Amino acid sequence: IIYSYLEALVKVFFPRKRKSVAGEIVLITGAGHGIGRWTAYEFAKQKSRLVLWDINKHGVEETAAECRKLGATVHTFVVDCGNREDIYNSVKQVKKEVGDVTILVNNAGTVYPADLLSTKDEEITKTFEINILGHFWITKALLPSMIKRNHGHIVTVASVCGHEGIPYLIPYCSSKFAAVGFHRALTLELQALGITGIKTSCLCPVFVNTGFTKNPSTRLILETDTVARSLIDGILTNKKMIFVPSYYNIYLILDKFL
Amino acid sequence: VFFPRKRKSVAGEIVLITGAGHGIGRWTAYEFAKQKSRLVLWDINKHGVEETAAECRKLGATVHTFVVDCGNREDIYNSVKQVKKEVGDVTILVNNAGTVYPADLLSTKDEEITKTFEINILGHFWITKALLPSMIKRNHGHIVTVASVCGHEGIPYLIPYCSSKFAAVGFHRALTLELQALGITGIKTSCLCPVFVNTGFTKNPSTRILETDTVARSLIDGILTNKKMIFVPSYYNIYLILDKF
Ligand SMILES: NC(=O)c1ccc[n+]([C@@H]2O[C@H](COP(=O)([O-])OP(=O)(O)OC[C@H]3O[C@@H](n4cnc5c(N)ncnc54)[C@H](O)[C@@H]3O)[C@@H](O)[C@H]2O)c1
Ligand SMILES: NC(=O)c1ccc[n+]([C@@H]2O[C@H](COP(=O)([O-])OP(=O)(O)OC[C@H]3O[C@@H](n4cnc5c(N)ncnc54)[C@H](O)[C@@H]3O)[C@@H](O)[C@H]2O)c1
Ligand SMILES: O=C(O)c1ccc(NS(=O)(=O)c2ccc(Cl)c(Cl)c2)cc1F
Ligand SMILES: O=C(O)c1ccc(NS(=O)(=O)c2ccc(Cl)c(Cl)c2)cc1F
């Protein structure tokens, strides 16, 4: 309420400059539904060339048909973004068919809500493999070309779960904290290496009504199109930590004072 | 001094310390041996863990050692069966075992990234899932996660390690909240986050120098007072608060 009217005031008197992403080759994982699908529509309206990845073939082709109706060029690939071998083989395919990815959006995610003793060890493994390990394989495959050209943008889709824990979501919160840490260390390392042209953004939304989980963990709801608008607005202005809603940054700051 | 925290006793508790064969794990073992606890020491380095145990026995403590790969789920479960049969139910778990392979992202080997996660965070899940049930049954336990300042702030050339350390802090925070949500009042949690400790784990600090024994003293003092987030040095909490501004 107090931050909501103060930030809207700061966005007019002190606006951040918007860059263009037209013609960029944007790779979005988990583009077959929810945040990934609606982020794809935002980049299609930005006149980007899209590469969409997902284990759900039907859904990613449905996202691609809608992006093409928006005027964009789109290539889809069925890729398990938690499988290292599949990711590397698919990067070879993208280079051969599309070119060098310039903007990577690591959005694919998985969750198996349960208290620690009711979890399956395979679900814990899959949570890490997709929510953080997969970011490493995809980033390692696409970063060389971005470094060579001094031009890229690594977007990590994490969660408020990457900043604060939640009961019954221990393995998921842990993998989301791992995603925030990967974004922070990546940001610092690129800067230490003198690589000025590669930007980084972390998207941390609260509960989004996508069916990913059933209900919010608190007495809080975000729509998918709002989160995609927040993400694209943050990417175009090179915002490093994007909270949706942005006022959640003060709740997290107050937690570090108790 | 004006507001002191009460110190509990850990005498006779069964304390399991992973990575007890050297550094923080070894000197934490000596602290618990002086506290009159029943120690269970785990490490992939047999020679080093038995060397820690001989020194713990000279301190008056009863000690059991096991050679366990704390990044291997099957090895951890089989070893927990052995600990129950030979020692009993662990009451205090110190998830200290860790690994690091310093390099820029494009110089990391995918196997090193995998091993970093398997030992620094996945192993905490398997060990905690094996030991937490008896703690819940008895409404009495203490889960200690040895993380790092790397679990709060990133560092160049340590991306996979920082990511696994952030995962460890997150596991500690979601565990604390879940135990509380379930009405489990008797199980305490502590997170140890030291800056560079001179143990040989890494060659030099990443920024512009703790001694092993100081970190072990800070850890035991935090456990005995039920401190949830232990920073070594403690003042390195205001540096993290200033970063968020
Ligand atoms: N929905 C929320 O409340 C919420 C909040 C914060 C963050 N997030 C994060 O946002 C991201 C997207 O969530 P969503 O709500 O849009 O989810 P969703 O269920 O709508 O879709 C996620 C997509 O990822 C795909 N995916 C899953 N496993 C995959 C794999 N191995 N390889 C490739 N693709 C895979 C699924 O097929 C699906 O199309 C996730 O990382 C999630 O953790 C979600
Ligand atoms: N040393 C530092 O600067 C520093 C700073 C902050 C946090 N930490 C953390 O403290 C912990 C201990 O670090 P240290 O400096 O005492 O290290 P160390 O190198 O002195 O000893 C770590 C011990 O863990 C054991 N270990 C490694 N892999 C294992 C495995 N798979 N199974 C079982 N044991 C295994 C090693 O054999 C070794 O005895 C680690 O988790 C580390 O990340 C270290
Ligand atoms: O990532 C998810 O799928 C996800 C699930 C549940 C959720 N619960 S919430 O919206 O009530 C909420 C709001 C603020 C905070 Cl600090 C926290 Cl931890 C939680 C938030 C999520 F991001
Ligand atoms: O875990 C390690 O092995 C480890 C390695 C290097 C290190 N560098 S440091 O002590 O200069 C330092 C001081 C303040 C901050 Cl915030 C950070 Cl991230 C780092 C700290 C470590 F914990």
XYZ file of C-alpha atoms and ligand atoms in Angstrom:
635
model
C 0.000 0.000 0.000
C 2.757 2.478 1.076
C 5.340 0.934 -1.333
C 2.684 0.503 -4.110
C 2.031 4.282 -4.415
C 5.698 5.283 -3.747
C 7.100 2.919 -6.453
C 4.473 4.008 -9.039
C 5.660 7.617 -8.276
C 9.363 6.609 -8.694
C 8.547 4.903 -12.068
C 7.408 8.247 -13.602
C 9.940 10.762 -12.132
C 12.783 8.213 -12.431
C 11.935 5.749 -15.269
C 14.283 2.905 -16.285
C 15.273 2.749 -19.991
C 13.665 -0.020 -22.082
C 15.880 -1.964 -24.484
C 14.697 -3.773 -27.616
C 14.574 -7.579 -27.864
C 13.350 -7.614 -31.537
C 15.216 -10.222 -33.549
C 16.829 -11.816 -30.466
C 16.760 -15.639 -30.309
C 14.810 -16.355 -27.069
C 14.825 -19.843 -25.587
C 12.042 -20.452 -23.047
C 11.877 -23.773 -21.149
C 8.530 -24.953 -19.729
C 6.816 -22.926 -22.481
C 3.936 -25.457 -22.766
C 1.814 -23.832 -20.036
C 1.527 -21.004 -17.439
C 4.387 -18.566 -16.877
C 6.463 -20.045 -19.738
C 3.570 -19.879 -22.240
C 2.540 -16.312 -21.346
C 6.212 -15.182 -21.317
C 6.432 -16.623 -24.896
C 3.444 -14.455 -25.918
C 5.177 -11.363 -24.452
C 8.369 -12.027 -26.462
C 6.283 -12.767 -29.596
C 4.756 -9.253 -29.273
C 8.383 -7.897 -28.780
C 9.226 -9.291 -32.313
C 11.803 -11.855 -30.951
C 12.616 -15.208 -32.683
C 11.437 -17.954 -30.310
C 12.797 -21.367 -29.354
C 10.293 -23.166 -27.079
C 11.165 -26.235 -24.976
C 8.950 -28.567 -22.972
C 8.326 -32.267 -22.195
C 4.630 -31.599 -23.143
C 4.700 -31.630 -26.987
C 0.972 -30.776 -27.417
C 1.147 -27.769 -25.091
C 4.351 -26.276 -26.501
C 2.972 -26.534 -30.093
C -0.245 -24.859 -28.844
C 1.883 -22.013 -27.370
C 3.827 -21.791 -30.701
C 0.642 -21.596 -32.812
C -0.534 -18.655 -30.704
C 2.940 -16.991 -30.927
C 2.836 -17.397 -34.727
C -0.661 -15.769 -34.783
C 1.092 -12.827 -32.947
C 3.521 -12.483 -35.945
C 6.571 -14.297 -34.464
C 8.903 -16.977 -35.944
C 8.918 -20.024 -33.543
C 10.789 -23.384 -33.365
C 9.638 -26.010 -30.802
C 11.603 -28.883 -29.338
C 10.477 -31.644 -26.953
C 13.235 -31.483 -24.338
C 13.477 -32.882 -20.784
C 15.053 -29.863 -19.066
C 16.150 -32.027 -16.111
C 18.163 -34.445 -18.394
C 21.743 -33.317 -19.156
C 22.184 -35.557 -22.258
C 18.823 -34.488 -23.773
C 19.665 -30.773 -23.154
C 23.109 -30.993 -24.873
C 21.739 -32.945 -27.869
C 18.903 -30.378 -28.206
C 21.344 -27.437 -28.062
C 23.134 -29.028 -31.093
C 19.718 -29.111 -32.873
C 18.945 -25.422 -31.991
C 22.348 -24.263 -33.328
C 21.819 -26.253 -36.564
C 18.201 -25.144 -37.132
C 17.845 -21.699 -35.545
C 21.215 -20.248 -34.499
C 22.776 -18.911 -31.325
C 20.354 -18.278 -28.416
C 20.700 -14.729 -27.041
C 18.110 -14.741 -24.219
C 17.673 -17.835 -22.060
C 14.623 -18.095 -19.807
C 15.090 -21.011 -17.346
C 11.404 -21.366 -16.447
C 10.753 -25.176 -16.337
C 9.894 -26.340 -12.841
C 8.435 -29.231 -10.847
C 7.008 -29.671 -7.313
C 5.677 -32.606 -5.228
C 4.054 -31.039 -2.141
C 4.368 -33.246 1.036
C 5.916 -33.089 4.518
C 9.600 -34.324 4.570
C 8.832 -37.860 5.819
C 6.032 -38.325 3.198
C 8.273 -37.441 0.201
C 9.581 -39.975 -2.356
C 13.391 -39.746 -2.784
C 12.825 -39.824 -6.655
C 10.620 -36.708 -6.354
C 13.384 -34.912 -4.381
C 15.890 -35.873 -7.110
C 13.558 -34.746 -9.942
C 12.925 -31.426 -8.116
C 16.679 -30.678 -8.055
C 17.348 -31.997 -11.563
C 14.732 -29.732 -13.156
C 14.638 -26.697 -10.816
C 18.420 -26.076 -10.577
C 20.744 -28.725 -12.193
C 19.026 -28.191 -15.556
C 19.755 -24.435 -15.361
C 23.492 -25.351 -15.152
C 23.440 -27.618 -18.233
C 21.406 -25.170 -20.349
C 23.458 -22.142 -19.265
C 26.777 -23.963 -19.873
C 25.608 -24.840 -23.403
C 24.384 -21.363 -24.368
C 26.889 -19.046 -22.491
C 29.958 -19.490 -24.852
C 28.224 -17.807 -27.786
C 26.934 -14.958 -25.546
C 30.508 -14.428 -24.158
C 32.013 -14.518 -27.675
C 29.543 -11.787 -28.771
C 29.526 -9.948 -25.352
C 25.736 -10.087 -25.553
C 23.126 -12.156 -23.760
C 20.512 -12.319 -21.022
C 20.138 -15.200 -18.467
C 16.680 -15.230 -16.828
C 16.241 -17.561 -13.834
C 12.625 -18.259 -12.892
C 12.848 -18.948 -9.175
C 9.958 -18.053 -6.611
C 9.409 -16.256 -3.247
C 10.302 -19.872 -2.045
C 13.899 -18.977 -3.053
C 13.958 -16.311 -0.301
C 11.684 -17.824 2.387
C 10.793 -21.427 3.301
C 7.299 -22.950 3.338
C 5.984 -25.989 5.244
C 5.364 -29.137 3.073
C 7.554 -27.674 0.266
C 11.053 -28.370 1.746
C 12.702 -29.983 -1.358
C 11.081 -27.369 -3.603
C 12.116 -24.387 -1.436
C 15.672 -25.772 -1.278
C 15.855 -26.054 -5.112
C 14.382 -22.501 -5.402
C 17.023 -21.139 -2.984
C 19.614 -22.948 -5.196
C 18.171 -21.080 -8.252
C 18.496 -17.642 -6.497
C 22.085 -18.512 -5.518
C 22.953 -19.566 -9.076
C 21.590 -16.182 -10.326
C 23.596 -14.216 -7.666
C 26.934 -16.060 -8.209
C 26.466 -15.896 -12.024
C 25.819 -12.095 -11.849
C 28.992 -11.594 -9.736
C 31.211 -13.921 -11.839
C 30.269 -12.269 -15.220
C 31.148 -8.875 -13.610
C 34.434 -10.266 -12.156
C 35.394 -11.554 -15.639
C 34.769 -8.155 -17.273
C 31.774 -9.503 -19.242
C 29.581 -6.377 -19.386
C 27.177 -7.440 -22.162
C 25.462 -10.417 -20.498
C 22.524 -9.420 -18.265
C 20.839 -11.516 -15.559
C 17.285 -11.427 -14.125
C 15.614 -13.549 -11.424
C 11.833 -13.818 -11.387
C 10.425 -14.434 -7.902
C 6.594 -14.472 -7.973
C 4.309 -15.380 -5.047
C 1.413 -17.887 -5.760
C 0.348 -17.712 -9.449
C -2.996 -19.365 -10.429
C -1.484 -21.817 -13.014
C -2.384 -25.170 -11.374
C 1.328 -25.719 -10.446
C 0.107 -26.146 -6.790
C -3.528 -26.119 -5.527
C -3.683 -23.065 -3.185
C -1.318 -20.360 -1.740
C 0.558 -21.394 1.460
C -0.602 -18.156 3.279
C -3.830 -15.982 3.586
C -2.766 -14.088 0.389
C -4.172 -14.090 -6.330
C -1.690 -13.470 -9.221
C -2.832 -14.209 -12.775
C -0.354 -15.695 -15.298
C -0.555 -12.734 -17.717
C 0.420 -10.297 -14.915
C 3.532 -12.349 -14.082
C 4.532 -12.489 -17.764
C 4.067 -8.666 -18.001
C 6.211 -8.215 -14.864
C 8.913 -10.515 -16.275
C 9.137 -8.830 -19.729
C 9.128 -5.334 -18.126
C 12.003 -6.412 -15.858
C 14.038 -7.981 -18.723
C 13.672 -4.873 -20.915
C 14.931 -2.666 -18.049
C 17.726 -5.130 -16.942
C 16.246 -5.624 -13.443
C 18.253 -8.234 -11.521
C 15.654 -9.289 -8.920
C 12.037 -9.147 -10.062
C 9.484 -9.799 -7.307
C 5.829 -10.306 -8.293
C 4.247 -8.321 -6.656
C 7.237 -5.964 -6.230
C 6.064 -4.987 -2.700
C 7.089 -8.483 -1.496
C 10.674 -7.223 -1.262
C 9.736 -5.257 1.912
C 8.120 -8.332 3.587
C 11.434 -10.205 3.051
C 13.470 -7.241 4.367
C 11.278 -7.093 7.522
C 11.888 -10.866 8.091
C 15.662 -10.144 8.305
C 14.895 -7.867 11.361
C 13.196 -9.998 14.090
C 25.492 -10.000 29.453
C 22.261 -8.010 30.136
C 20.186 -10.557 28.156
C 22.002 -13.947 28.263
C 20.762 -17.057 26.439
C 20.317 -20.235 28.523
C 22.759 -23.098 27.801
C 21.318 -26.612 27.604
C 23.191 -29.861 28.321
C 24.132 -32.302 25.541
C 25.732 -34.914 27.898
C 24.708 -38.423 26.888
C 23.083 -37.296 23.617
C 23.921 -39.347 20.527
C 25.623 -36.877 18.159
C 26.244 -37.812 14.526
C 28.821 -35.621 12.762
C 29.479 -36.088 9.024
C 32.823 -34.967 7.563
C 34.369 -35.520 10.999
C 37.729 -36.607 9.513
C 39.147 -33.062 9.275
C 38.501 -29.323 9.849
C 35.151 -28.053 11.149
C 33.770 -31.609 11.564
C 36.847 -32.807 13.539
C 36.960 -29.776 15.860
C 33.146 -29.906 16.346
C 33.645 -33.578 17.417
C 36.199 -32.423 20.045
C 33.679 -29.841 21.353
C 30.959 -32.490 21.784
C 33.496 -34.905 23.372
C 34.186 -32.248 26.051
C 30.317 -31.854 26.441
C 30.180 -35.616 27.457
C 28.064 -36.629 24.358
C 28.062 -40.146 22.721
C 29.678 -39.478 19.307
C 29.040 -41.146 15.925
C 31.534 -39.964 13.299
C 31.109 -40.345 9.518
C 33.545 -39.695 6.688
C 34.854 -41.155 3.388
C 38.398 -40.744 4.848
C 38.774 -43.734 7.230
C 42.255 -42.730 8.512
C 41.166 -39.185 9.369
C 37.917 -40.085 11.110
C 39.689 -42.710 13.299
C 42.346 -40.057 14.103
C 39.526 -37.681 15.218
C 37.959 -40.526 17.289
C 41.258 -41.388 19.043
C 41.586 -37.741 20.143
C 37.852 -37.722 21.199
C 38.450 -40.860 23.295
C 41.487 -39.157 24.929
C 38.955 -36.384 25.900
C 36.859 -39.021 27.793
C 34.110 -39.640 25.182
C 32.603 -42.871 23.761
C 33.026 -42.789 19.948
C 31.858 -44.895 17.009
C 33.228 -44.344 13.502
C 31.695 -45.370 10.158
C 33.163 -44.938 6.646
C 30.161 -43.406 4.834
C 29.831 -41.512 1.501
C 27.471 -38.737 2.630
C 26.552 -37.965 -1.016
C 25.355 -41.600 -1.649
C 21.699 -42.296 -0.670
C 22.100 -46.133 -0.529
C 25.288 -45.927 1.590
C 23.606 -43.433 4.004
C 20.486 -45.627 4.562
C 22.538 -48.818 5.050
C 24.797 -46.955 7.539
C 21.789 -45.602 9.478
C 20.702 -49.280 9.970
C 24.200 -49.971 11.387
C 24.069 -46.902 13.748
C 20.660 -47.970 15.140
C 21.949 -51.533 15.732
C 25.283 -50.485 17.299
C 24.714 -47.116 18.973
C 20.980 -46.231 19.076
C 18.865 -43.318 17.893
C 20.783 -40.182 16.874
C 19.567 -37.137 18.823
C 21.796 -34.403 17.302
C 22.660 -34.476 13.584
C 25.483 -32.206 12.312
C 25.284 -32.187 8.474
C 28.853 -30.857 7.982
C 30.319 -32.950 5.054
C 30.985 -30.736 2.061
C 32.811 -30.534 -1.274
C 33.861 -27.716 -3.660
C 35.538 -27.502 -7.097
C 36.492 -23.860 -7.624
C 36.317 -22.772 -11.340
C 34.464 -20.333 -13.618
C 31.149 -21.841 -14.902
C 32.552 -22.806 -18.332
C 35.558 -24.585 -16.676
C 33.429 -26.728 -14.319
C 33.000 -30.405 -15.114
C 29.322 -31.545 -14.995
C 30.389 -34.421 -12.568
C 31.779 -31.814 -10.151
C 28.466 -29.897 -10.242
C 26.584 -33.161 -9.554
C 28.916 -34.173 -6.681
C 28.603 -30.677 -5.156
C 24.800 -31.028 -4.989
C 24.829 -34.691 -3.939
C 27.070 -34.015 -0.914
C 26.240 -30.388 0.017
C 22.419 -30.660 -0.033
C 20.908 -33.988 -1.360
C 22.832 -35.903 1.316
C 21.280 -33.668 4.002
C 17.835 -34.862 2.796
C 18.742 -38.579 2.994
C 20.430 -38.290 6.406
C 17.658 -36.122 7.866
C 14.897 -38.407 6.492
C 16.596 -41.405 8.152
C 17.155 -39.778 11.552
C 14.196 -37.373 11.873
C 11.580 -40.182 12.570
C 12.975 -41.178 16.007
C 13.453 -37.477 16.957
C 9.750 -36.884 16.065
C 8.687 -40.050 17.970
C 10.591 -38.770 21.066
C 9.812 -35.022 20.471
C 13.539 -34.422 20.952
C 16.311 -33.634 18.513
C 18.576 -31.031 16.917
C 19.288 -30.687 13.146
C 22.485 -28.679 12.452
C 23.070 -27.643 8.833
C 26.616 -26.542 8.067
C 26.129 -24.106 5.206
C 28.462 -20.961 4.594
C 28.260 -17.167 3.957
C 28.008 -18.576 0.322
C 24.437 -19.618 1.279
C 23.524 -15.910 1.618
C 25.735 -14.230 -0.999
C 27.258 -15.425 -4.307
C 30.993 -15.540 -5.092
C 32.748 -15.577 -8.481
C 34.298 -18.984 -9.471
C 32.133 -20.789 -6.854
C 28.732 -20.809 -8.697
C 27.808 -24.521 -8.206
C 29.038 -24.376 -4.604
C 27.150 -21.158 -3.747
C 23.989 -22.641 -5.313
C 24.296 -25.818 -3.148
C 24.981 -23.630 -0.067
C 21.856 -21.521 -0.787
C 19.981 -24.892 -1.075
C 21.312 -25.837 2.412
C 20.060 -22.518 3.967
C 16.663 -23.045 2.270
C 16.419 -26.623 3.584
C 17.148 -25.324 7.116
C 14.473 -22.560 6.814
C 11.694 -24.725 5.309
C 12.514 -27.520 7.871
C 12.260 -25.032 10.825
C 8.925 -23.754 9.512
C 7.567 -27.279 8.817
C 8.483 -28.666 12.313
C 6.701 -25.587 13.796
C 3.660 -26.042 11.473
C 3.407 -29.707 12.598
C 3.460 -28.757 16.312
C 6.870 -30.424 16.829
C 8.315 -28.286 19.648
C 11.177 -30.554 20.775
C 13.302 -30.581 17.589
C 15.710 -27.617 17.289
C 17.496 -26.406 14.143
C 20.766 -24.467 13.659
C 22.519 -23.226 10.505
C 26.276 -22.575 10.663
C 27.400 -19.923 8.165
C 31.126 -19.165 8.563
C 33.237 -16.954 6.283
C 36.652 -18.365 5.060
C 38.059 -20.908 7.561
C 41.740 -21.936 7.225
C 41.094 -25.715 6.801
C 42.505 -26.323 3.304
C 38.917 -26.676 1.901
C 39.747 -23.749 -0.482
C 43.198 -22.137 -0.975
C 42.430 -18.472 -0.179
C 39.464 -16.226 0.822
C 37.459 -14.869 -2.145
C 37.400 -11.273 -0.718
C 40.085 -9.090 0.989
C 40.586 -15.478 8.101
C 39.055 -17.797 10.762
C 40.771 -20.602 12.615
C 39.067 -24.051 12.700
C 38.783 -24.139 16.598
C 37.024 -20.731 16.703
C 34.340 -21.972 14.286
C 33.825 -25.150 16.383
C 33.496 -22.973 19.533
C 30.966 -20.730 17.735
C 28.990 -23.780 16.540
C 28.794 -25.532 19.963
C 27.881 -22.221 21.690
C 25.070 -21.714 19.150
C 23.743 -25.306 19.508
C 23.680 -25.098 23.325
C 21.686 -21.801 23.106
C 19.347 -23.049 20.267
C 20.500 -20.305 17.851
C 18.863 -20.775 14.442
C 21.339 -18.835 12.253
C 24.941 -18.827 13.427
C 27.245 -16.500 11.487
C 31.018 -16.753 12.068
C 31.924 -13.945 12.726
C 28.471 -12.920 14.057
C 28.941 -9.322 12.913
C 28.975 -10.617 9.276
C 25.139 -10.401 9.569
C 25.117 -6.576 9.218
C 27.202 -6.865 5.985
C 24.414 -9.062 4.525
C 21.707 -6.624 5.723
C 23.555 -3.678 4.085
C 23.716 -5.647 0.775
C 19.870 -5.789 0.763
C 19.874 -1.917 0.641
N 2.743 -21.165 -10.086
C 3.274 -20.652 -8.984
O 2.605 -20.397 -7.983
C 4.736 -20.304 -9.001
C 5.219 -19.315 -8.159
C 6.548 -18.934 -8.228
C 7.380 -19.556 -9.121
N 6.899 -20.519 -9.930
C 7.843 -21.148 -10.918
O 7.475 -20.765 -12.216
C 7.824 -21.816 -13.145
C 6.639 -22.141 -14.013
O 5.517 -22.465 -13.166
P 4.036 -22.475 -13.743
O 3.109 -22.120 -12.646
O 4.060 -21.668 -14.988
O 3.880 -24.029 -14.096
P 2.950 -24.899 -15.068
O 2.539 -26.136 -14.367
O 1.925 -24.003 -15.648
O 3.960 -25.203 -16.275
C 5.352 -25.526 -16.062
C 5.818 -26.147 -17.352
O 7.115 -26.770 -17.170
C 7.107 -27.976 -17.903
N 8.139 -28.876 -17.401
C 8.083 -29.649 -16.272
N 9.067 -30.509 -16.162
C 9.826 -30.288 -17.302
C 10.987 -30.907 -17.809
N 11.660 -31.875 -17.176
N 11.462 -30.471 -18.998
C 10.822 -29.481 -19.625
N 9.724 -28.825 -19.245
C 9.268 -29.281 -18.072
C 5.699 -28.514 -17.757
O 5.452 -29.438 -18.807
C 4.873 -27.232 -17.878
O 4.463 -26.956 -19.211
C 8.367 -22.972 -12.294
O 9.784 -22.915 -12.247
C 7.793 -22.678 -10.908
O 8.585 -23.236 -9.869
C 5.613 -20.905 -9.883
N 36.517 -23.981 5.068
C 35.776 -22.930 4.735
O 36.269 -21.856 4.353
C 34.285 -23.048 4.873
C 33.512 -21.904 5.055
C 32.148 -22.018 5.269
C 31.570 -23.264 5.279
N 32.330 -24.361 5.091
C 31.658 -25.703 5.110
O 32.081 -26.409 6.241
C 32.069 -27.827 5.957
C 33.376 -28.448 6.370
O 34.440 -27.745 5.710
P 35.955 -27.873 6.206
O 36.666 -26.617 5.864
O 35.910 -28.357 7.602
O 36.462 -29.040 5.236
P 37.645 -30.116 5.253
O 38.195 -30.213 3.875
O 38.542 -29.817 6.386
O 36.892 -31.443 5.684
C 35.589 -31.774 5.156
C 35.425 -33.244 5.447
O 34.280 -33.764 4.732
C 34.636 -35.035 4.232
N 33.786 -35.375 3.098
C 33.883 -34.925 1.806
N 33.103 -35.554 0.960
C 32.444 -36.484 1.752
C 31.507 -37.491 1.457
N 31.022 -37.725 0.237
N 31.079 -38.266 2.478
C 31.562 -38.044 3.700
N 32.448 -37.133 4.098
C 32.854 -36.381 3.073
C 36.102 -34.933 3.869
O 36.677 -36.230 3.805
C 36.635 -34.092 5.028
O 37.152 -34.879 6.092
C 31.687 -27.962 4.477
O 30.289 -28.204 4.344
C 32.019 -26.585 3.914
O 31.235 -26.271 2.768
C 33.656 -24.278 4.889
O 6.629 -21.220 -5.788
C 5.430 -21.698 -5.622
O 4.957 -22.579 -6.326
C 4.667 -21.084 -4.504
C 3.789 -21.871 -3.763
C 3.077 -21.339 -2.706
C 3.231 -20.003 -2.362
N 2.553 -19.470 -1.226
S 2.209 -17.899 -0.935
O 1.882 -17.270 -2.177
O 1.238 -17.915 0.116
C 3.669 -17.124 -0.320
C 3.740 -15.742 -0.297
C 4.842 -15.129 0.260
C 5.872 -15.889 0.775
Cl 7.187 -15.076 1.568
C 5.822 -17.275 0.698
Cl 7.176 -18.242 1.203
C 4.712 -17.904 0.162
C 4.092 -19.197 -3.094
C 4.782 -19.753 -4.132
F 5.628 -18.956 -4.805
O 32.625 -21.671 1.941
C 33.865 -21.443 1.608
O 34.690 -22.328 1.419
C 34.210 -20.003 1.460
C 35.092 -19.621 0.453
C 35.461 -18.300 0.290
C 34.960 -17.323 1.141
N 35.378 -15.970 0.955
S 35.348 -14.771 2.062
O 35.573 -15.359 3.348
O 36.251 -13.773 1.580
C 33.725 -14.091 2.059
C 33.404 -13.076 2.949
C 32.149 -12.499 2.895
C 31.214 -12.954 1.981
Cl 29.617 -12.264 1.991
C 31.541 -13.983 1.108
Cl 30.353 -14.650 0.042
C 32.801 -14.549 1.130
C 34.064 -17.678 2.147
C 33.710 -18.997 2.273
F 32.789 -19.313 3.212
